[PDB]
Amino acid sequence: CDAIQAAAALGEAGISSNEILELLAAAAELGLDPDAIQAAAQLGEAGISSEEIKELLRAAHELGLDPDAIAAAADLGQAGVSPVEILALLIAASVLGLDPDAIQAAAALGEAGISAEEIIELLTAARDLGLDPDAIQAAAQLGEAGISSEEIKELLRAAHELGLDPDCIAAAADLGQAGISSSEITALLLAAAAIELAKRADDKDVREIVRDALELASRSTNDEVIRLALEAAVLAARSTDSDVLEIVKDALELAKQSTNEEVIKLALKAAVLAAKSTDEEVLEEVKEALRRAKESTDEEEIKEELRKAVEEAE
Amino acid sequence: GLDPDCIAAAADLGQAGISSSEITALLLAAAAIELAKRADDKDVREIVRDALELASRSTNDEVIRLALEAAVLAARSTDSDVLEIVKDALELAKQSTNEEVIKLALKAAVLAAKSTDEEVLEEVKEALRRAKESTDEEEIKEELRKAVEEAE
Amino acid sequence: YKIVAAAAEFLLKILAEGGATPEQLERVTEHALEVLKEVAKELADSPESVREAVRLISKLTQEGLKQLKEIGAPPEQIERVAEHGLEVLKEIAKYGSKLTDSPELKRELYRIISETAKELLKILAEGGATPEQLERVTKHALEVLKEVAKELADSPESGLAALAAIASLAKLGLEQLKEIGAPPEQQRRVTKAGIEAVREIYRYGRKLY
Fold this sequence. Notes:
Chain A is mainly α.
């Protein structure tokens, strides 16, 4: 007896009789189905007033929401999302055109204490990157790992630039559970990518370069030097030109033998810029700046010749 | 006409500790709602809105049972005269602020919906018209009283 | 602009160190804001200039409220200058919307408006004002945000951002009202007004999507 079953559900939720009569009045006004009234009962278990529920369901009706999103409003209620923020997430889902699994991910991010603005931003970034619901589910696992919204955004950006699968992002969330910094996760992602690509490339010189970069990254302790070296390893593994491999090898031969971070930062920057460039004149001037750096001995002259080439290439 | 699973759900409102009159109200309400869903009629749906509004806003078991019994009777009837009388009674109950006027107006509408004499319908409609055109609660009560004492 | 803006802030801080009455401080603050608005309306002609204008207006506003808080003035004066600041800020945001076309700067500008609201609300709450003032200010702040959103918004993403900002302001405001222990009646009144602001924002959103 559906109308009485809905009343019994509100009775099991412990709703006051006048407030049952109000939720029934709302059900009669809007034509609420028993599962929409069950969502009202679950918002009542979340302690929301009949008035607030009524305006919320009135808004859901004025939005023309799909019943699955309307049911998922009770999941956002169980996640403890602020009453307005529930409406915001519902509006956002409607504007985004995403599935209820994106709403379940929003509920998980709500349990992780993430604001509706950050959720909306994360979903915005996800659609703008062209990421999928499994990548969004792994992002919710980074939320379970307590990673900050900006760190997730940059991690997702890096994962997209590396062409990673969602399972890779799940492994990144496992490094998050291990308490690894977003920087060190990013390094490990760069490294794993460079290594797998260095299997796919057969070339011993690429493999030497990638090993030398992985050695330098294992020996050093600075996040810029590490990211530059491992990015250079990914770039070397993506490259096909002996001029880029020579410039990178020369830069690594200078850098791995050097004791000052300044010339390492500059030489790795020059090599990364050369590997990203498309002009033989810039490659030759960088190869020249490295030749000048091998034939000279003063670190101030090495830094200046690398600075000239970097300011030409940047 | 509620079947035994409805009575089982009524026993579950018993498990929720709801008082017998409140269970009765909830049964009347749920019945009026399911009937007003099975009927398409916006006017019956307006009556059910206004009844459930009044029942939520007030707190007296006689007023509530009168209102929801009228809502069930509206969901069980089709004549425009009965719908007009019920809407006039609910409009008078929404505009006035005396529980004796509310009880008398709802009682007059319930008697008009239970009976089927067009002279009782017209005298109840005219007593409600006198009550809705006038301002004095004593004139409202004395017109509704004469109509009730003729109709009961 | 930065120089004269700094000169206004400096003069205000000097006057506050000088121990002038809350009334004199408020009068000078209004005059300073009015001048600041004028010289902003003249000198602003680029996205960064609007960003900087808002940053300086909000800065001077924050310093002003901090002075009134430190001297222990009644919340009434604080609420007046809060309204003045928001109103001026809105008029500048209005002008700045004519100068600014890039989505990033439009969004970040709105975000800074919301940060300004969040901060001035937080400052008033730290100021120990009654819920009776907190609701007036919260409502006005939401309404100013609504008017600014209605002025700026022209794509769904910016709508969602403005919505989310509004929602977060409601969340913060309700969190202050909860901390001061305001009655559920006031909590409902404010929350419903917040929902209604979001409903009006959705009535705008219906244009975009």
